[PDB]
Amino acid sequence: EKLSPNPPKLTKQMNAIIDTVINYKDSSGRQLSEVFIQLPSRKELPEYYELIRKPVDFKKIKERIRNHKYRSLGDLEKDVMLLCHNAQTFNLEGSQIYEDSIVLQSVFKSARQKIAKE
Ligand SMILES: O=c1nc2n(c3cccc(Cl)c13)-c1cc(C3CCNCC3)ccc1C21CCCCC1
Numbered sequence: 355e356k357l358s359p360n361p362p363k364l365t366k367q368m369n370a371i372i373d374t375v376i377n378y379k380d381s382s383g384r385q386l387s388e389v390f391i392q393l394p395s396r397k398e399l400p401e402y403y404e405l406i407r408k409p410v411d412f413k414k415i416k417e418r419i420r421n422h423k424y425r426s427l428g429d430l431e432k433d434v435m436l437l438c439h440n441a442q443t444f445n446l447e448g449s450q451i452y453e454d455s456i457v458l459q460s461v462f463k464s465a466r467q468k469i470a471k472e
Pocket residue numbers: 389390391392393394395399402410411412437438440441442444445451
């Protein structure tokens with residue numbers, strides 16, 4: 355089965371996991387994903403592209419689910435962990451963005467364990 359199409363059930367699970375991550379709010383009602391939806395342009399933040407080898411945003415992850423680029427829930431996981439890794443690489447330790455990216459890793463893993471195990 356190594357090369358085979360993604361079942362509709364799997365694609366639905368992928369979208370539900372990523373929607374849980376994108377929609378996640380703190381107790382104040384702030385949506386943590388907001389800044390991570392779209393990458394900055396190379397004109398507005400050139401130094402991002404000098405430091406980050408493999409840029410990714412949540413828009414691109416949603417596109418990759420739709421175009422069947424993830425072979426597995428593990429491949430989806432790897433791209434979400436890459437996004438969060440890039441945020442921690444570029445942004446200052448202790449910054450809101452840096453901290454938010456750590457919480458989103460946990461939100462992803464919780465959603466995967468709950469949705470795929472139920
Ligand atoms: O790691 C990121 N740091 C950042 N971003 C990101 C956007 C998507 C994915 C990631 Cl993983 C990041 C990101 C995105 C923006 C967008 C650009 C288009 N207009 C909406 C805002 C602006 C600034 C950023 C930072 C955070 C703040 C400091 C500069 C860079």
